[PDB]
């Protein structure tokens, strides 16, 4: 039975609204992707099926280009990897874009005669592209992408005779820049891109009332509130860390539109985002678009050295509730999580608490994530009172944002009880 419905809204096209009253934590929907990729620097360091970072991955013979965890991971993705896997072959060491290579196993999931579960409420022809609303450095940029989809595609597509009708390459990818999730792991760490139809029918605020988790590719849909019946559900199409200019920027220019929520008019937190001296923070935000860039491609020990720059040339001067700094700290920390350095990981990461709980109002499922690594980094440390602190927290949070439905939710009951035993026994 759903508790979720379509339907037309005034003005920001078509929508999703409640059926019934809805409490924080209850799942609304659930899906796997119609499709779905590994994102460009994850490739190679996680599995393309199940999205988990292994130490040793077993490639594909024929292409060498997928990698998986395990023989029943290269089994299931097969479906997915057979149409695609020449392509891949042929081009190396060149991979295309993310986007591309996406759409590539579109295409052939669209032909495929059963109902797409991840369909239900919404297809992939019912998506928008903003056609009408594109500007020409943007269309100049689709017909590339077209061209480049034609030129991957050779061994498998030579036609447009070779695909449904009713499909369109170049609308096709306009729906993918407005219609793309960012899959990200249990960490949240950005592994993949894939399509949900379904969900893609939620709208935009900075506010949102509805949260998305994802548990390897599959899909959660959570109330984060209290909902009253036929109101329209929402959810954040953006990483909260980022100033009403910054957020209308990308919306405008990403998305075609004006956002004008409650946060965007106000310019809700802005100035806590932007404490400190402007000359100073500029260059936190410049040397970020590199940082964010080696994370990408999981190098931990470039991005330790360059946070570790920031953070001792900052400290007498900018204020860590500085998004731009705070982001440092954010990248300090898992990079060092990563590299075993579980001190000092912690020592960044307890810098990030009380600038979350003030950016990530209520229950976000980035900040239960944040909270439960600083509560296991305080396990570890030997630290049991905080870290029992720190855990129910993460708890709390997580409880509506990812649910028991969520595989994370296991481990953290397991780590409260190894805490609680560590209490018991000193
Ligand atoms: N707060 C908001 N104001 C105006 N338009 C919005 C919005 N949030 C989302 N949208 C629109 O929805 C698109 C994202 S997909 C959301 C579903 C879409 N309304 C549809 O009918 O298919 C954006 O490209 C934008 O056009
Ligand atoms: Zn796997
Ligand atoms: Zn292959
Ligand atoms: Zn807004």
Redesign the pocket.
């Given at each position: 039975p759903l508790k979720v419905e379509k339907f037309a809204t005034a003005n920001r096209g078509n929508g999703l609204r409640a059926v019934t009253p809805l409490r924080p934590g209850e799942l609304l929907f659930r899906s796997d992707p119609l499709a779905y990729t590994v994102c460009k620097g994850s490739r190679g360091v996680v599995c393309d099926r199940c999205l988990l970072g292994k130490e040793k991955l077993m490639r594909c013979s024929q292409c060498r280009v997928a990698k998986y965890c395990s023989a029943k991971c290269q089994k299931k993705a097969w479906p997915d990897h057979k149409r695609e896997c020449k392509c891949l072959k042929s081009c190396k060491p060149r991979y295309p874009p993310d986007s591309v290579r996406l759409l590539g196993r579109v295409v052939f999931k669209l032909m495929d005669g059963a109902p797409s579960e991840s369909e239900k409420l919404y297809s992939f022809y019912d998506l928008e592209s903003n056609i009408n609303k594109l500007t020409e450095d943007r269309k100049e940029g689709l017909r590339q992408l077209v061209m480049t989809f034609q030129h991957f595609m050779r061994e498998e597509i030579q036609d447009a005779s070779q695909l449904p009708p009713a499909f369109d390459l170049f609308e096709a990818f306009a729906k993918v820049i407005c219609n793309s999730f960012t899959i990200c792991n249990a960490e949240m760490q950005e592994v993949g891109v894939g399509l949900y139809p379904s969900i893609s029918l939620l709208n935009?605020?900075?506010?949102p009332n509805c949260s998305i988790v994802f548990n390897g590719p599959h899909l959660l849909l959570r109330a984060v509130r209290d909902i009253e019946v036929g109101e329209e559900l929402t959810i954040?199409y953006?990483d909260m860390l980022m100033t009403?200019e910054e957020?209308?920027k990308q919306?405008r220019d990403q998305y075609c539109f004006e956002?004008?929520?409650?946060?965007?008019?106000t310019q809700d937190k802005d100035a806590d985002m932007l404490t400190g001296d402007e000359q100073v923070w500029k260059e936190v935000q410049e040397s970020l678009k590199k940082i964010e860039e080696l994370k990408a491609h999981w190098k931990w020990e470039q991005v330790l050295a360059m946070c570790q720059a920031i953070i001792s040339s900052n400290s007498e001067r900018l204020p860590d509730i500085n998004i731009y700094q705070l982001k440092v700290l954010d990248c300090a920390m898992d990079a060092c999580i990563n590299l075993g350095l579980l001190e000092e990981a912690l020592f960044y990461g307890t810098r990030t608490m009380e600038p979350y709980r003030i950016f990530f109002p209520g229950s976000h499922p980035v900040r239960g994530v944040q909270v439960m690594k600083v509560g296991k980094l305080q396990l570890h440390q030997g630290m049991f009172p905080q870290a029992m602190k720190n855990l129910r927290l993460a708890f709390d949070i997580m409880r509506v944002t990812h649910g028991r439905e969520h595989s994370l939710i296991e481990d953290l009951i397991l780590l409260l009880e190894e805490c609680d035993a560590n209490i018991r026994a000193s």
């Amino acid at each position: 039975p759903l508790k979720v419905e379509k339907f037309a809204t005034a003005n920001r096209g078509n929508g999703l609204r409640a059926v019934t009253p809805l409490r924080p934590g209850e799942l609304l929907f659930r899906s796997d992707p119609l499709a779905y990729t590994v994102c460009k620097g994850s490739r190679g360091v996680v599995c393309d099926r199940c999205l988990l970072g292994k130490e040793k991955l077993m490639r594909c013979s024929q292409c060498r280009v997928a990698k998986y965890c395990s023989a029943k991971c290269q089994k299931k993705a097969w479906p997915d990897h057979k149409r695609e896997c020449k392509c891949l072959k042929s081009c190396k060491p060149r991979y295309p874009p993310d986007s591309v290579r996406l759409l590539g196993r579109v295409v052939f999931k669209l032909m495929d005669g059963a109902p797409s579960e991840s369909e239900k409420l919404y297809s992939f022809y019912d998506l928008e592209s903003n056609i009408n609303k594109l500007t020409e450095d943007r269309k100049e940029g689709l017909r590339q992408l077209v061209m480049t989809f034609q030129h991957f595609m050779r061994e498998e597509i030579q036609d447009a005779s070779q695909l449904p009708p009713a499909f369109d390459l170049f609308e096709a990818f306009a729906k993918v820049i407005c219609n793309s999730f960012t899959i990200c792991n249990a960490e949240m760490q950005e592994v993949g891109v894939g399509l949900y139809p379904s969900i893609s029918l939620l709208n935009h605020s900075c506010d949102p009332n509805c949260s998305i988790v994802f548990n390897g590719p599959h899909l959660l849909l959570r109330a984060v509130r209290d909902i009253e019946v036929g109101e329209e559900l929402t959810i954040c199409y953006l990483d909260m860390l980022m100033t009403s200019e910054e957020r209308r920027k990308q919306l405008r220019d990403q998305y075609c539109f004006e956002c004008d929520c409650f946060r965007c008019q106000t310019q809700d937190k802005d100035a806590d985002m932007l404490t400190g001296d402007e000359q100073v923070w500029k260059e936190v935000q410049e040397s970020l678009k590199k940082i964010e860039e080696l994370k990408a491609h999981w190098k931990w020990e470039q991005v330790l050295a360059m946070c570790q720059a920031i953070i001792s040339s900052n400290s007498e001067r900018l204020p860590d509730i500085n998004i731009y700094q705070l982001k440092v700290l954010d990248c300090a920390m898992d990079a060092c999580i990563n590299l075993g350095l579980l001190e000092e990981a912690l020592f960044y990461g307890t810098r990030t608490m009380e600038p979350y709980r003030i950016f990530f109002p209520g229950s976000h499922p980035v900040r239960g994530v944040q909270v439960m690594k600083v509560g296991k980094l305080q396990l570890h440390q030997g630290m049991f009172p905080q870290a029992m602190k720190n855990l129910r927290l993460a708890f709390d949070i997580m409880r509506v944002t990812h649910g028991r439905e969520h595989s994370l939710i296991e481990d953290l009951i397991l780590l409260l009880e190894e805490c609680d035993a560590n209490i018991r026994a000193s």
